[model samples]
Target: MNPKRIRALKSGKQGDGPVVYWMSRDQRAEDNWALLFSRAIAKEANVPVVVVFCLTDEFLEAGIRQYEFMLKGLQELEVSLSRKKIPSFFLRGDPGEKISRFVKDYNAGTLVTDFSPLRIKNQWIEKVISGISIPFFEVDAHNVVPCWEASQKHEYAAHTFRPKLYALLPEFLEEFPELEPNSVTPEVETLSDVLETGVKALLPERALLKNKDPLFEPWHFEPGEKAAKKVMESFIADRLDSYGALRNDPTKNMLSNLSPYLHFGQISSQRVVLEVEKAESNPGSKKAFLDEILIWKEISDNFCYYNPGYDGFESFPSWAKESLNAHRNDVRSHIYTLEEFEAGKTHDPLWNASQMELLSTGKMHGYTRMYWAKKILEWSESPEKALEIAICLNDRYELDGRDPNGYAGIAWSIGGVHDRAWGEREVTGKIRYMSYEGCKRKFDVKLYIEKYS
Candidate 1:
């Protein structure tokens, strides 16, 4: 692995204890840079390597649906790792406290964690760094090109970020070295009680969670690396060729439904990119998919990494902020409270349908996600309020909510984060607008509304 893939959070001499990969964002054992790097470090130090996961009940708006999906993936990951003699432990509580204490108790040599740009995760890392004396490393296991390597400062848009990312692809997009079983063994702790349900005391049985909520249903896309791989296989072999033409159509199933897996770190984005490259797809479709995966995805990480107010009004482009401020008092035909929008109660059938899709299936079509947020901006009191309502709904209901992409997507929709100023409009001002009629012209709006409703 390239040294650029790893960032030394805390540098020091090696310790005698095991190498702890305090896994966070990227969860899969296979082709994970953090785990591979941890194994390499342990090999050189002649110490065993183990993976640790710290669970928190309060990860910004996560509920039973998101929690159940992640736990099931972790369950599969634990068994897969065990076959290779790599012990995985789950701790329930504040990650900063539990991880610091776990490493110290085991006298671990160094701690390695997967990189995330979210404020909460970074805060946890800061606490862990302050508490732990041993070395700490962070790996860019999510993006194909490491987020830091892509750009130190956030690039303004895809055009600005794309050149920088594509130029470095050859160096970073090489094959991942196979992860073999641990060569050495030491007594490993299995926090089985916490492993089953991190907060069994607070939450009910995982199986019964769905029985309680009428809207909750079994995840259409099963959670885990194996399931993610199967999705990629099917998408590449069957749908990649049609991705360019049909991806934006709500009625078509051409969009790759990999957002939740990618968001959960159950699958590697690099692995997905590599798999797509081998497919015999249309050049246009292939480029389209790559643009979404590499450019849109990486730029999102870059934005979250650099912008502190990624999910707020402050992150908007200066022109957008000025434009939005000018139209702050523009009147609307209908103004919806958060409760109204969340329950998919609204005057616009198109917007309500998109919200209904999110409420029922934990996913809305890619095109409709834009329409959904834009409608929120149109119907809310102000851009600030719209951003809040959008983030609250997105993070709470959508499986891939609270992800950097969701923040960026909503930002682009409501605040014009990565968008160019358009001709001034009413409520939206210079921010690009999506109209109910525009969707009707693009797809079978009636069919989509009927399907979701």
Candidate 2:
């Protein structure tokens, strides 16, 4: 593994205690650079490598559906770790406090964790460092090229980010080295313990706990590395050939449903890139798929990593901010509350269906996602309020909520962060507009509405 993948967060004395791999963004046991780095450090010190995962009753605005999906995946992950002789434990409460306590009590020498660009994770990392003096390191196991390695600044658009990414892809997109099994065994108890007890107990109370799609319709999503690879296989074997032609069409199911896995770090983007590269399919289709995951997805991380205002109206380009401010008070033909939007009560039939699809299934169609966020801008009272509502609903409902992609995508649609200014219009100003009429021309919007309605 490349040493560039690891970042030194804090320097300190190395203890003889086991090197703790505090698995965070990347949850899997295989193809994990963070986990491998932990082993390399531990081996040098003649110490064991142990795993710890800290849990919280609430994370941002994440609900039961998202929690259930993640915990189930971790359960599968513990087994994968154990078979390779790595002991894994799960701790509950504030992530920073729990992690600090584990490292202190275990007398850990080195602390290693997977990297995330989100502010909350950065906050938690600060909390962890404040309490511990161990040598702390963060590994960019999620992104194919480390976010810092890809670019030092937030990219203005896909075009600017693309060339930078393409330049580094050759160096960072190599195949993952197989994980080496550990030689030392643990003396402490394995706390696959939290898995059996905490899942149901930890989830927050909700009205729609019973409202989950009986089988995540169109497809079922089983979490963990095992299932993630399977999904990649099926996407390649079944749908890859038609990806270029139908991926943007909501009625067509040609797009890969791999975002959740990518979001949770259950699968590495590099692993997906390697698999797709080897598959025999339409070259244009393969290139399109790569563009979405490599260029589009990677740029989202770039946006969040470099822009602290990533989730706020302040993140918009100056031109967009000026344009949106001018139209902040423009009259909306229809306005709706967060409650109405959450319940899918909007007057626009297609927009209402878009909301329900997110509510019922943990995922939403890609094409409608743009239309859904933009409509929120059109129907809400103010641009700021529109951004707030869109992010709130998105973080609470989508399986891939709380991801950089979601944050950046919503920013693009509602604030014109990465997108160019479109024709000037009411309520939306210079920001791009996707109307009911425009969507009607793209796909059978009524058919989409009837299915979800």
Candidate 3:
């Protein structure tokens, strides 16, 4: 293991007790940097590692489906940790409050947690950090390269971030450290009893408690690492070669269905990258997949990090902002509120069907997603309003909603991030505009529309 990969806890007054690893972003047992980091610390201190996952009742954009998926993954996590002589604890309540209570109650010496770039996770982290007096440390286990390590400043576009990422990729993309199970198990709360009793007692009527189903479309997800790995392996074997050529086609299943897993940190980006690199012998296919992982995912992270208000409208480039503003007062051909869009009742058959597919299956084709957002931009009264509506609908419905990629994709479609302007248009101004005919020219749009509709 590279020692530089591990950052020491800076705070003081840490005692020699069981090390508390707060399982938040990185959820899996294998190829997990945070879990590995925690295990190393536990072994050094000659104490057991206790894994804690707090079920926050108030996490935004999360519903019963999300919880159900996460809980199933955690069930596997519980078993894996138990075999390692480490106990997994599930507490229900405010995440900050629950974590603070766990840290205090366990008398944990050092608290290690995975990093998250989102505002909601950051808020919870801030609250927990303030609430705790012990030495708390964060690990950048989520990214192949740490966000700050990738680029200290917000990158202008993929072109700007790509070179920087390439330079640092070698340094950041090292092999994961081998972690062993503890010889001595730590005594902790009964996870099964807690889950069964607490879920029955504290869970709301809205909570979706069934954990066995592999697919939970009602809640927008299916949970667990093994299931996620299977999905990735299947994609690598069956669909990866045609990914570049057919991924944009909404009528086919060419794109990797790995977003929800990546979003929940059930799998690591490095693991995905490594597998893709090993699986495909074709250099072109490997390059294409790598671009998707780095250019797309890393760019999203940089955008969110650089622009704190990226979720809002002003985060678009100057050209996009000015163009969008110019069209703000333009007479609208169609204007649908959030509810209308959410219900998939838009005038455009294609857009409506895309939204419906996302609502029903918790997934949408990458190409359709672009056309779907662009249509909203053109049909709505203003670009800003369209962005708001798109984000709201996506966050509310899609399994992979409320992520940096979601925001970036929406913003890119509506406000032209990482893209040059097209010829002037009615509602979109100079911003790149996609139409039904454009999609038709590229793929079987009619078939897609019919399938989703």
Candidate 4:
């Protein structure tokens, strides 16, 4: 861990009071660089470190599922922070405005925040940097290798990004530094009244919200640091060994289902990597886990960073763009409205079942996600419209919705972001396509559909 301050902002004249960790991306108790930075600043200043979360109703395509998952995670986070004698607060409304107001009230001297590659998060950070007259710092807590440090240019493909990540892996893959509590005596008390109700009440009404319909009720999964840790621990204990090859098998539970936790920042990639490294007595397990934690993450980060608007189909490679454009007017064999797809009533029972699985479990097998997105392209009026509808629907429903991974995955499947053309085809052009027969051969499609449906 670099003890040296990386990027610190200085606003004219101000003395250190409470150091505010503007909690956005990294929402965990342990193995969090941003939180540790906050604690370090507080210790240096001889003051308390406060954590603040700003909740806004307006996120691009994100709806209730994203909100519920985030709120549930935060509800758990507050209790964990309280254990560490750190105060956590969730303020409602626009993040930029709320953060500024919170900073003013606390008289915060230095503010530390986690990195976000999405344009929306960047917008909030920009507003904070420009709005507040205080020293601020942004920590790259999302990835093992920092986004800016990874490369200077947008990568053409994963092969380009993979080596860059591998080169820097040794430096960034060190175990997380233990975050010690501030040695100074506590000077401030949490205002008892300021602690609002937990996310149970704050959660968007699931019944009323269209997006929340995807996540089935009575989800054994509750959000927070504890759940994240438990999930990771269980994955390492039971499943990671077989994950390398079986991860693509939809019928089996082989993939590490830690994505929602990762997306919500409830679990840090550092924590997952460290544990996986420790559990890597077997060569295959180690290789598989590292590929997921490092290579895939680096690819997603590179995709988003290089193509800022990578979520849109037009942002794909020229071949993909030209191909899809050429096939734009090609007659659709079957077209379903977004609502019909959302209802899981598509013509293909296999596709409907896969969508239904995500709708029921808040998760779908990784390989299946590709098929799900591609089928939308195959059935929609045009590839561009397919990309738009697929992404919107995925973001709206999945527990891990509206993340860089989600955007990149949709783009890759529908618009061919990270892949090359597969000879020219109808609608998809060179874009890789998945078929029901391929899925049936790979896994028990009947079993998968029967289980979900």
Clashes of 3: 1
lDDT tens digits, residues 1-453, model 3? 544445544477877788888888788878878888888877888887888888666543454445556666778878877787777887877888888888888788889887767787778888887888888877777778877677888777788888888998777777776669888766635546645654454335332213633222554345778878888888888888888777677888877889889887888889988788668466776788899887889788888878888887777889878877777777878888776777677778888878868766777878778887888887777776787888876775566777889988887888788788889877789988777778778987788778865
TM per candidate comes to: 0.95, 0.95, 0.91, 0.91
TM-score of candidate 4 on Cα atoms, chains taken together? 0.91
lDDT of 3: 0.76
Clash totals for all models, in order?
0, 0, 1, 1
lDDT of 2 at 225: 85
lDDT to native, each model: 0.86, 0.85, 0.76, 0.77
Pick the winner on lDDT between candidates 1 and 3: 1
* TM-score: model 3 vs. ground truth: 0.91
**Which of candidates 1 and 4 reaches a greater TM-score?**
1
- For model 2, how many clashes? 0
Model 2 alpha-carbon miss at residue 425, Å:
0.4
Better of 2 and 4 by lDDT: 2
Q: Looking at candidate 4, what is the lDDT of residue 39?
A: 85
Worst 10 residues of 1 by lDDT: 201-210
**Which stretches of candidate 2 lie above 4 Å from their native place?**
188-204, 207-219
Error of 1 at 274 (Å): 0.9
